[PDB]
Amino acid sequence: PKKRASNGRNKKGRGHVKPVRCVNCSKSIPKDKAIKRMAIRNIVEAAAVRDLSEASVYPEYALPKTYNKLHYCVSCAIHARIVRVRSREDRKNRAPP
Amino acid sequence: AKRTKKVGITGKYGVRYGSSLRRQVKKLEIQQHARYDCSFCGKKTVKRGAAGIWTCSCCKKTVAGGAYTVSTAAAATVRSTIRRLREMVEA
């Protein structure tokens, strides 16, 4: 039977969406179907902040951050636990955790 | 009335030489016997004299061109890239 009203994707009123590639395995997946996450990371990994601060030539250095958008296919997202299998009623919960 | 279904001008060749060779000859013969637009006088009066020579019967200008068409795609792209490089020599 039909599992999802959205057919596992987000495409109502288009027909075709250009694909992207999984960052883990390079599988081609449509852009609306993929498992987009936003990795916004400190550049210095929270344990070297003191060391880089005392090694800095500048005071009040802003310490930039890295920005990356990760696209996952369904297999790689489930295997990497980015999403996991939810119960039948909880599948409908759209909200982030 | 339509005399031939598909051979066209290559109907002069009869049943010889093979249909695939006759098809390629048909495609090139239509192009080399076609009449073309004159870029100087503006009329459809350009015809081939020999391979690579295209003369307008109205204004008597003669342009060097392709063997079977008045301009090849390679020559068009070369004209475009020469114009781009020339424009870069000033800007």
């Binding site: - | 870029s39 100087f40 006088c41 503006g42 009329k43």
Partner: protein, 96 residues
């Protein structure tokens, strides 16, 4: 647009088509504007510019060849040059 201005001039104004009549109108001083096609020969173009310089007549260079100029003035034949003698209810003389 220039095509719309030309169409309005053809609809409600005085014009002449062609090199001989254009030069005749330039000599008689009746020409208010001359419009020369892109692919006009340079000798004819410089001759018309010299005549227009003597006549103090404005020159417009139409983008597109004689085929496009004939279509723009609404004729089924190619037109190399068109001379606007009287622009009626059109702003082609005031603009450009």
């Amino acid at each position: 647009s220039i095509n719309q201005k030309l169409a309005l001039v053809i609809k409600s104004g005085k014009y002449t088509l062609g090199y001989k009549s254009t030069v005749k109108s330039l000599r008689q001083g009746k020409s208010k504007l001359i419009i020369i096609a892109a692919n006009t020969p340079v000798l004819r173009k410089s001759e018309l510019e010299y005549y227009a310089m003597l006549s103090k007549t404005k020159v417009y260079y139409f983008q597109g060849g004689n085929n496009e100029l004939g279509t723009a003035v609404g004729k089924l034949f190619r037109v190399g040059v068109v001379s606007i003698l009287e622009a009626g209810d059109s702003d082609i003389l005031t603009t450009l």
